[PDB]
Amino acid sequence: NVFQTRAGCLIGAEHVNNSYECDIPIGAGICASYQTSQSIIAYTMSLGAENSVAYSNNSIAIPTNFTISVTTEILP
Amino acid sequence: ALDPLSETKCTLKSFTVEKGIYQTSNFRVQPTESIVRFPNITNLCPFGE
Amino acid sequence: IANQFNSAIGKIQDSLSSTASALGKLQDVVNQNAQALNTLVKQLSSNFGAISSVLNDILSRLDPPEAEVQIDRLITGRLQSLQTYVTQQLIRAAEIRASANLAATKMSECVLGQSKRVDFCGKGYHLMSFPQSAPHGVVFLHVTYVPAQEKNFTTAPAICHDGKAHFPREGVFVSNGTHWFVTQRNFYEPQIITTDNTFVSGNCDVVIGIVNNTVYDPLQPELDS
Amino acid sequence: VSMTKTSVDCTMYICGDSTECSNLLLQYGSFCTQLNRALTGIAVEQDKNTQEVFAQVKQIYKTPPIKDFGGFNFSQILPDPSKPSKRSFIEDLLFNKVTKFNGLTVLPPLLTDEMIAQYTSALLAGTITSGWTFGAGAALQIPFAMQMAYRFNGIGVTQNVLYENQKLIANQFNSAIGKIQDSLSSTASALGKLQDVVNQNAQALNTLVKQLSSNFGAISSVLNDILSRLDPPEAEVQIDRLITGRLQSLQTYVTQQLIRAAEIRASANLAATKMSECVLGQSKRVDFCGKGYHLMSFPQSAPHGVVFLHVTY
Amino acid sequence: VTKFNGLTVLPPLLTDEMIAQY
Amino acid sequence: KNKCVNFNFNGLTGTGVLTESNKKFLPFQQFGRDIADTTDAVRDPQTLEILDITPCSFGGVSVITPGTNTSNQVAVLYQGVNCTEVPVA
């Protein structure tokens, strides 16, 4: 498991073409995580799912329902 | 060294002191006496050898 | 709204109780201070080039003229330790003072009143917040209005009835495929198109995409009655 | 937004390839430990700015194949798929105008430029379709003619102007975007605020390297010379002089980096605030989004920063 | 969320109770 | 014991309070030290027992005074000092 990256040589990590959410940041958009017989792996940090929003001149949507959410924020 | 009020003027280097709380020389507890605990020793150094 | 809110507050108690890392922002202030205090103290054991780190030792080792040479090394090095400590505390103090001003700003816009800023009180449209005391800090619980479900509708920028373009006074025009209804952007509440809900400006030959419909005038049945 | 990531090695910097010099450095305690912890925290905060600024959304947004913008031309602001790397025509100009062995290590950035363009593309694609909604909640399809109509109603301009003058608003806007491209291409100093970050970093690193040649009262600045000349007891005197000064040199560097670290983070917080108020939604603040009544803004990526194009009335 | 060398810890101007009463 | 004194134990010098300790040491264990590498305990060489070492009380002195145009009455505050430790002044 000897691979090369823009940050440098990385030993002990398998390269997975599938992109996942960053767990342990490394660099150059590369991150490592412990997953599936589980072992460390290397992957490109994903920006999330691709959502293509329909767009048209005559098309619009009106929200039919709402939800009250409570956000927690902390400051020193 | 006169009184605490003078120490305030002495600390601020001013003959006038405005209302407030100010820090002065720190307080420290000094020892009451010296304590010496050593093991028993008798014989002279080996000046014979 | 009574169930959604009460159910939301319950999740806050379960999250803060189950997840102890949400407060890590405050724990960092405690760790940073511990490292500074611990490090500042451990520097006393360092030699700083001196023969020994104990003052009475050097005074009890080297002669008066020789000791001062070594004592100066300890005073010099130990002096730099304080400068490093004070230097970091002043810098770290700037990060805390910047946060304090931020906390004071949120309480004004979020807690006391209602804030129109975008995502300043948190995601969604802000309503009101709950201040909560926290060690060496503060916690804000922000209640917001988040839209959930939506449905695609047909819209037109204007309506044409008597030859003068009719525009919405508030909300937008929508249609289910048969008749054109007026509705707010944040929720779906069908409303009949009327002169009171629309305004008359220009003609029908200017607006691009204008459609034809029947604008109901409440004054018609009154005049007939 | 982001500043160059640097990692200084205080073991090699002070004592090159020297055992005796190293043993004399251990007498000074944790000084070399503090210098690494301070710089380590900086590199983390430099990348933390990109997370709080560049990414405002958890989803990627794309434009439809059929482009009806209502008369505006976004070809300049949106990425060009024909290019080898994903960037817009404006970002292409933004990247072009802005641009060791002693133990100084340049760490790579946590966020690549390609991934920055994806953030802007998501924000740009959203405003074209979802308008102000995607930032405040789930993506909500709205027609453009309705989008600008609401943005004028918020500033006190009845939407009558839009539908009637739409042809005129289309000419003023498109002509305005063209002026931005010409100004950015001709004027290279518009990004000078970003060039200063590069110049300051180079000056700090250049100085830090030049301090190694200073004598600091020592007979010679080279450690090998002191060891190859003086006896072991006499060499300690000369080596201590070099170490003592090189310690002050590192303390000066870290001190300046911590000060600049507070400046870059302050700027990053401002960028995150504008993206929230100016880009995602519409702000009523006075001259926060730029002179005039704020309509909406276009985020654009630039080296070690971000550019905001503010459309105002 | 939770010395002998002459380092002093100043008490806060306001107790945890007062901040809770705000 | 229970007093501020200058102690010398088999060449170990220091100033602090000496008290009996429930802290246990091993047979070979004599001079201990804290996280700061300063001795927090010692065993008496002659009679064998463990003594807890605490530094003699210390703190700052703050003077509470009104404006000079008001009056010269002053109140002294002893930082981190017990009432029984004041007479030491």
Numbering used by the authors:
A (entry chain C): 641 to 676, 689 to 728
B (entry chain B): 292 to 340
C (entry chain C): 923 to 1147
D (entry chain A): 729 to 827, 854 to 1067
E (entry chain C): 826 to 827, 854 to 873
F (entry chain B): 535 to 623
Sentences from the paper on this structure:
We carried out cryo-EM study to delineate structural changes of the Kappa S trimer, and obtained two cryo-EM maps, including a one RBD-up open conformation (termed Kappa S-open) and a transition state (termed Kappa S-transition) at 3.2- and 3.4-Å resolution, respectively. For the open state, the angle between the long axis of the up RBD-1 and the horizontal plane of S trimer is about 72.5°; while for the transition state, this angle is 44.1° with the RBD-1 appearing less “up”, and the other portion of S-transition is in similar conformation to that of the S-open. Moreover, the population distribution of the S-open versus S transition is ~49.1–50.9%, in sharp contrast to our previous findings that, for the WT S trimer, the S-open occupies only 6% and the S-closed about 94% of the population. These data indicate a much more fusion-prone status for the Kappa S trimer. Here we determined two conformational states, including the S-open and the open-prone S-transition, for each of the Kappa and Beta variant S trimers. Compared to the WT S (94% particles in the tightly closed state and only 6% in the open state)8 or the G614 S (35.6% open, 26.0% transition, and 38.5% closed), the Kappa and Beta variants display a great population distribution shift towards the open state (~50% open-prone transition state and ~50% open state, without detecting tightly closed state).
The spike (S) glycoprotein of SARS-CoV-2 mediates receptor recognition and viral entry into cells. It forms homotrimers protruding from the virus surface and, once engaged with the host-cell receptor–human ACE2, undergoes a substantial structural rearrangement to fuse the viral membrane with the host-cell membrane. The S protein is also the primary target of the humoral immune response during infection. A large number of SARS-CoV-2 neutralizing monoclonal antibodies bind S protein, especially its receptor-binding domain (RBD), providing a basis for vaccine development.
